Design a protein around this ligand. Structure first.
Ligand SMILES: [Mg+2]
Length: 1202
RNA sequence: AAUUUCUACUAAGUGUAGAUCGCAUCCAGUAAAG
DNA sequence: TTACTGGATGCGTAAAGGACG
DNA sequence: CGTCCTTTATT
């Protein structure tokens, strides 16, 4: 009974293995003498050029069919689409009409005589040349005759456009699912807003845009949809909505622009038309230090247009007082937070001063309709913001001094960068080497980017009642120029952040358009590539064009050494292959098929469906079985042992066997002298298939991909991992020069980088070079493999995980959380919430033999964050931080694999689609999304390298506990052994009671503080404990619906940390506050005494002391020792939870700190989800809803503790 | 600081630990408030 | 002020079939 | 003829 070992052999997946290809003997000389690498480097450049020409005809062909087309269901479909109350029967009716519309478009493409020609040999040889009218381009298309097969990959990408399926690539999908849906949405908007378009206004658009051929009204009729399937038609429909610029250039207004003015001027909010997506085929980075520089000097020198727009905006905002503050607006969003801080010094006083009108009891249903109407507002005027400004304070004037300050900072940074704009300037060193120059460019780009992004706020996205067009004329003219710095900034950074070496490479064909397409022995002559073995080494052997049969004549040599030549036989896609070989002209004449058989096949009765007859399909199987016996190329290759015909449920049952049996890989001997003579003579080219695990010097654990490769040829592998066709071979030219490589010379000691490593220094007898693999031309071989090609353990993975989890008695859950003090933190938990393991993943411990050496990835990030600070915040140090985290999670992935294998344990992760990231965490959402992907990817085939391959868990019996990755958005609910969870109330929660602070202790008023004190049931001093006790029922406070116990007694127990920072003893601080105001706190219930006090400084110290008491999480930034969690509430045995009581222990039953609490509590929400499983029936486990609500969580956290 | 490739390395000396789905094609613009 | 690649397509083929000398 | 390039068949 192990939940893990029930998830093997579940579904197939493809993977690619990569290797260096090292030429052997005279291979590279003979490749050089034949100029093969030059031919292929040119062919790659021509190949990319031909595809763009091929696109042109494909584009032109699409318009021919799209213009002719007329959709049949159009009116009926649109009405059914519009009904908002459709029976489920009518929803399936709509799907049928939607499918038929896509089929009308696709069948219009595929019904042509011409369609079949586009993806055949003919297009390059004949159809394209006649189409083109340029002599040069026709010559390029002519370069690829006899090379048509190599275009197959490109053809398929285009076949996707003409599919009828609802897929992103399809034309019919763009037309029907996307454009037609938008068209219908625009008809709805049109009828509401039809009248406001002026009679003159429409007659304009008909002559200016339409050219008088159609009326603007036609474009919002359903039957007129056919016009807009073409890109030409889309351009016209979008032009009505957006507006047009004629050949004369006169600006023509658009319908959506009219709507803007109306809703603006009348302070209304009518809807606006969606433009139509482009058709599917209608219409790069800087490459050198000289180009990167040339753009910086051209776009940002002191007489560039961007610098001209800065001088105009300086003159515009210098006259800020001259304009109407009622017609100047600031877009609502983050810019409201910033500008609020800029002038008052406070983020949320602008928040308050419109809360001032809007602001007293708070049901969250009212608090959302509060908080929401809030977000609805689009912008604020300078007058509205001045209405918020206290008297004697001018909002416009101190905005002027802030904007003007930002332009003066640009001009100062220009003077520090002035020599970078001399026509005389030349570059001494490369930019990445030249930290000084890159820092100068960055400083200037930043000062202009920040000025741009800050000024962008003065829009109001209007859509805005009467705007100061005198201000927004000069402002829009200058800003559209200034906006160009965004593209410039991103391009220059992306260049500096790049690596020094280049991964650029090109494909090698060896003059075969289907080169190395497959490995089948019979096709070895046609493909001219095969695999050899000599001891531990493996080789790719390529037969030269003039000697395709040279390897076939070789025989085994009894006396001398022998290569092992691969014997690879595959029967691919038997459902696809079996008919073509048996219904081919060549075989159909040989073997008389009874009319029943060709009927059944032409009728489709063997295929499952309403046309399906078991006996008919059975008859087809026996026909195939007999023909396979008569077909000896197949019968002799594979030892076929078919199940008896009568057993088969469908035709796929017979195919499934043929597919599994249709695979064989063995090796044949071949004379090493004869083969090596072929290589010497130039008849054969030989590369060693190589990574560093094949080196003589290599020792210790190999790469997981090295194991996959060797297992392809291991006789203990029985179709678990098949060697797939479609391998490719590339040349990646050297990107670095050897003389320019960083060297650590031999016999001189090199300092080690790891602080934890005891050995501080290493000395070798040989030289070592940084990035040596890019200082030389390198072949690389890509090999596709097929894992679990015939899966036998067919079940829905989530349903099985739910069945096992329910009936599993002691479910183990692995919780993972992101901490502020800890990159990641792990808590493993048994089926009842007890903590089994808890530790930080700040240090990755690497094992080699019995030795252990750890790496503190938290200290690595700390040193690189300090390196970021030094040298401002350099473009590279951010990349170095981004890559180091990416390599960190690849270490953690294996640490979770062990824990899943060790505890047979389910994983608990944060749902990043719902939760909100505090940004105190070191691992930002983006790096964590990447992690949760890698976790998914590894769990499709989870393998422990150090396990014996035949074992379950080993490289031949990998675990499949996770479905294939789909999207970041699909990382919700559950993916097999992984459950995604909201992070709400996982850290700031007492693990020993489930208690949470639901109180709002922010001070607003004396009157608001009095109702707060009165809402408690009792506040008294407890002499026998020297504590203050605050009894409360959460029902007497607002926004407290989620709590389940309701009644709690708080205590001023222990210390807190106020935030610089100070330590506050709660009990004595309350006594200090009460003594300052003459309150007698020993006199039983004190509640009347506090409310009697009339001083506001009392209630502010009182609310602040309540804030500290309910602040269960206490930290000092920069003090990793202080992250303690303390509860103001007692448990069952009258103990207060204090996380420092458990951080001391080696094995603690409760979390050791705030970061462990989250990982502890993320795992407990899975336990709740397992609890819901144990409530349902085996058949309805699919129906059980996993997502936990805050009210279900607080009920579980407060009852499960006991 | 060597790598099929990536990160961390130097890991006891031409390398260590973990990870690693390639190749082509198309369409995109969202986000985001204790 | 944000950092946007993120989504989905499709192949991972041997043997029929034909063109060209 | 052979040889090389093409085209094909799809639960
Ligand atoms: Mg290794």
């Amino acid at each position: 009974m192990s939940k893990l070992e029930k998830f093997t052999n579940c579904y197939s997946l493809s993977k690619t293995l990569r290797f260096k290809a090292i030429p052997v003997g005279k291979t590279q000389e003979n490749i050089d003498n034949k100029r093969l690498l030059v031919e292929d480097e040119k062919r790659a450049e021509d190949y990319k050029g031909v595809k763009k020409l091929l696109d042109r005809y494909y584009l032109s062909f699409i318009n021919d069919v799209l213009h002719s087309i007329k959709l049949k269901n159009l009116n009926n479909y649109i009405s059914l689409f519009r009904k908002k109350t459709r029976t489920e029967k009518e929803n399936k009716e709509l799907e049928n009409l939607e499918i038929n519309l896509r089929k009308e478009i696709a069948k219009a493409f595929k019904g042509n005589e011409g369609y079949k020609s586009l993806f055949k040999k003919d297009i390059i040889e004949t159809i394209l040349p006649e189409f083109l009218d340029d002599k040069d381009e026709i010559a390029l298309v002519n370069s690829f005759n006899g090379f048509t097969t190599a275009f197959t990959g490109f053809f398929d990408n285009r076949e996707n456009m003409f599919s009828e399926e609802a897929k992103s690539t399809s034309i019919a999908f763009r037309c029907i699912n996307e454009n037609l849906t938008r068209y219908i949405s625009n008809m709805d908007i049109f009828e509401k807003v039809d009248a406001i378009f002026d009679k003159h206004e429409v007659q304009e658009i008909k002559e200016k845009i339409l050219n008088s051929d159609y009326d603007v009204e036609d474009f919002f009729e359903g039957e007129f949809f056919n016009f807009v399937l073409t890109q030409e038609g889309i351009d016209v429909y979008n032009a009505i909505i957006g507006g047009f610029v004629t050949e004369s250039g006169e600006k023509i207004k658009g319908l959506n622009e009219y709507i803007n003015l109306y809703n603006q001027k009348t302070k209304q909010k009518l809807p606006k038309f969606k433009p139509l997506y482009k058709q599917v085929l209608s219409d790069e980075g800087y490459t050198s230090d000289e180009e990167v520089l040339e753009v910086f000097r051209n776009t940002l020198n002191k007489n560039s247009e961007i610098f001209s727009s800065i001088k105009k905006l300086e003159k515009l905002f210098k006259n800020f007082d001259e304009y109407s503050s009622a017609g100047i607006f600031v877009k609502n969003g983050p810019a409201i937070s910033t500008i609020s801080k800029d002038i008052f010094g406070e983020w949320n006083v602008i928040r308050d001063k419109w809360n001032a009108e809007y602001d007293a009891v708070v049901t969250e249903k009212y608090e959302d309709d509060r908080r929401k109407s809030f977000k609805k507002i689009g912008s604020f005027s300078l007058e509205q913001l001045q209405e918020y400004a206290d008297a004697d304070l001018s909002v416009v004037e101190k905005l002027k001094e802030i904007i003007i300050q930002k332009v003066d900072e640009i001009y100062k940074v220009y003077g520090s960068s002035e020599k970078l704009f001399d026509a005389d300037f030349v570059l001494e060193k490369s930019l990445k080497k030249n930290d000084a120059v890159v820092a100068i460019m960055k400083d200037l780009l930043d000062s202009v980017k920040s000025f741009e992004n800050y000024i962008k706020a003065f829009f109001g996205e209007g859509k805005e009642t009467n705007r100061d067009e005198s201000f927004y004329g000069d402002f829009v003219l200058a800003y559209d120029i200034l906006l160009k710095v965004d593209h410039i900034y991103d391009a220059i950074r992306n260049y500096v952040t790049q690596k020094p070496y280049s991964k650029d490479k090109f494909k090698l064909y060896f003059q075969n358009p289907q080169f190395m397409g497959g490995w089948d022995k019979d096709k070895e002559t046609d493909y001219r590539a095969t695999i050899l073995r000599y001891g531990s080494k493996y080789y790719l052997a390529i037969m030269d064009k003039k000697y395709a049969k040279c390897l076939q004549k070789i025989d085994k040599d009894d006396v001398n050494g022998n290569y092992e030549k691969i014997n690879y036989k595959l029967l691919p896609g038997p459902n696809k292959m079996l008919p073509k070989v048996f219904f081919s002209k060549k075989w159909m004449a040989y073997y008389n098929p009874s009319e029943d058989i060709q009927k059944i096949y032409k009728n489709g009765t063997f295929k499952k469906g309403d046309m399906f007859n078991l006996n008919d399909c059975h008859k087809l199987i026996d026909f195939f079985k007999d023909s396979i016996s008569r077909y000896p190329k197949w019968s002799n290759a594979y030892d076929f042992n078919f199940s008896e015909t009568e057993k088969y449920k469908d035709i796929a049952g017979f195919y499934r066997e043929v597919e599994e049996q249709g695979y064989k890989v063995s090796f044949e001997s071949a004379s090493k002298k004869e083969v090596d003579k072929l290589v010497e003579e130039g008849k054969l080219y030989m590369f060693q298939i190589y990574n560093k695990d094949f080196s003589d010097k290599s020792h210790g654990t190999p790469n997981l991909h090295t194991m996959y490769f060797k297992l392809l040829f291991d006789e203990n592998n029985h179709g678990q991992i098949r060697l797939s066709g479609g391998a490719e071979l590339f040349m990646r030219r050297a990107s670095l020069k050897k003389e320019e490589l960083v060297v650590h010379p031999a016999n001189s000691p090199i300092a080690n980088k790891n602080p934890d490593n005891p050995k501080k220094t290493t000395t070798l007898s040989y030289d070592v070079y940084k990035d040596k693999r890019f200082s030389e031309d390198q072949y690389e071989l890509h090999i596709p493999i097929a894992i679990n090609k015939c899966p036998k353990n067919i079940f829905k993975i989530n349903t099985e995980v739910r069945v096992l989890l329910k009936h599993d008695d002691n479910p183990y859950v692995i919780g993972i959380d992101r901490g502020e003090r800890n990159l990641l933190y792990i808590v493993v938990v048994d089926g009842k919430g007890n903590i089994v393991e808890q530790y930080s993943l700040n240090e990755i411990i690497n094992n080699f033999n019995g030795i252990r050496i750890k790496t503190d990835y938290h200290s690595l990030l700390d040193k690189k964050e300090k390196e970021r600070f030094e040298a401002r915040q350099n473009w590279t140090s951010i990349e170095n931080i981004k890559e180091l985290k990416a390599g960190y999670i690849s270490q953690v992935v294996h640490k979770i694999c062990e824990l899943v294998e060790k505890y047979d344990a389910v994983i608990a992760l944060e749902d990043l689609n719902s939760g909100f990231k505090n940004s105190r965490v070191k691992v930002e959402k983006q790096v964590y999304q990447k992690f949760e992907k890698m976790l998914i990817d590894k769990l499709n085939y989870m393998v422990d390298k150090k396990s014996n391959p035949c074992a379950t868990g080993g490289a031949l019996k990998g675990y499949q506990i996770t479905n294939k990755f789909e999207s970041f958005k699909s990382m919700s609910t559950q993916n097999g052994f992984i459950f995604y969870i909201p992070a709400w109330l996982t850290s700031k929660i007492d693990p020993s009671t489930g208690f949470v602070n639901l109180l709002k202790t922010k001070y607003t008023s004396i009157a608001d503080s009095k109702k707060f004190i009165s809402s408690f049931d009792r506040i008294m001093y407890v002499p026998e404990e020297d504590l203050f006790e605050f009894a409360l029922d959460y029902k007497n406070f607002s926004r407290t619906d989620a709590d389940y116990i309701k009644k709690w007694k708080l205590y001023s127990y222990g210390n807190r940390i106020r935030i610089d920072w100070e330590e506050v003893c709660l009990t004595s601080a309350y006594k200090e506050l009460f003594n300052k105001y003459g309150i007698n706190y020993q006199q039983g219930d004190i509640r009347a005494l506090l409310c009697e006090q009339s001083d506001k400084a009392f209630y502010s110290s009182f609310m602040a002391l309540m804030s500290l008491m309910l602040q269960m999480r206490n930290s000092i930034t920069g003090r990793t020792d202080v992250d303690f969690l303390i509860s103001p509430v007692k448990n069952s045995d009258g103990i207060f939870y204090d996380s420092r009581n458990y951080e001391a222990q080696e094995n603690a039953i409760l979390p050791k700190n705030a970061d462990a609490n989250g990982a502890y509590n993320i795992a407990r929400k899975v336990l709740w989800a397992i609890g819901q499983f144990k409530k349902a029936e085996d058949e309805k486990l699919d129906k059980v809803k996993i997502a936990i609500s805050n009210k279900e969580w607080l009920e579980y956290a407060q009852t499960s503790v006991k």
